[PDB]
Amino acid sequence: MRPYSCSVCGKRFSLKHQMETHYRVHTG
Ligand SMILES: [Zn+2]
C-alpha cells in the first residue's frame, strides 16, 4: 500500500502522523 495504514483498523493514510493521530482512538 503506497500510503500507510491504520495497522489496526484496516484503513489507509499517506500521513504517518495522521494515522498515528488516529490511534488516539485505540485508547480506553
Ligand atoms: Zn485504528
CATH code of the domain in which 22 resides: 3.30.160
Cα gap 1→23, rounded to integer Å: 19
Q: Which domain holds residue 7?
A: 1-28
Q: Give the distance (Å) from ligand 1 centre to CA of residue 28.
A: 13
CB 12 within 8 A of CB 3: yes
Cα 19 to averaged position of ligand 1 atoms, centre (Å): 8
Q: Give the distance (Å) from ligand 1 centre to CA of residue 11.
A: 7
Q: Number of folded domains in the chain?
A: 1
What technique determined this structure? NMR
Rounded to whole angstroms, how far apart are CA atoms 16 and 21? 8
CA distance 12 to 24: 16
20's grid cell: 498515528
Neighbours of ion ligand 1 (CB under 5 A): 6, 8-9
